[PDB]
Amino acid sequence: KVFGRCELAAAMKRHGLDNYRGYSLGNWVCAAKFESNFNTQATNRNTDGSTDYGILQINSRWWCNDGRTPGSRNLCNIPCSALLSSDITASVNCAKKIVSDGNGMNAWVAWRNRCKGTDVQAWIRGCRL
């Protein structure tokens, strides 16, 4: 599923991400835009052999099991394919574990390089929330 901007903002809000660990909703929408272009089926392979999955591009070296990343952890205890569903529940629950691990949203390179320090509230402007 390819989400609309306000559609995704509303779904993330219902799943408890607005101000989760202090990150306003606009941060999460901006990260999803530049990680996946709002497409739940996005995958990208990394140089080290791991793969990033779903709307928030969660990586198989640490967070999910895809059966082809040797020596990886599965800290969210989920198959990586569950992160590609049109239902974003599994991606959100895993993202909550990631953002709590010590480095905040800096774990998402695109957030650091394209959202951090910008006017992220613009990503939810005009939405009925």
Pairing of strands 43-45, 51-53: antiparallel
By CB under 5 A, is residue 121 in contact with Cl ion?
A: yes
Q: Give CA separation, 27 vs 73, 98, 116, 122, in Å.
A: 27, 15, 8, 10
Question: How many residues make contact with Na ion (CB under 5 A)?
Answer: 8
Binding site partner of 101, from Na ion, Cl ion, none, Cβ cut-off 5-8 A by kind: none
For Cl ion, the binding residues in 21-40 under the rule CB under 5 A are 24-26
114 φ/ψ angles, rounded to the nearest 5 degrees: -130, -15
Residues that bind Na ion in the complex, under the rule CB under 5 A: 4, 6-7, 60, 65, 69, 72, 74
Residues that bind Cl ion in the complex, under the rule CB under 5 A: 24-26, 110, 113, 121
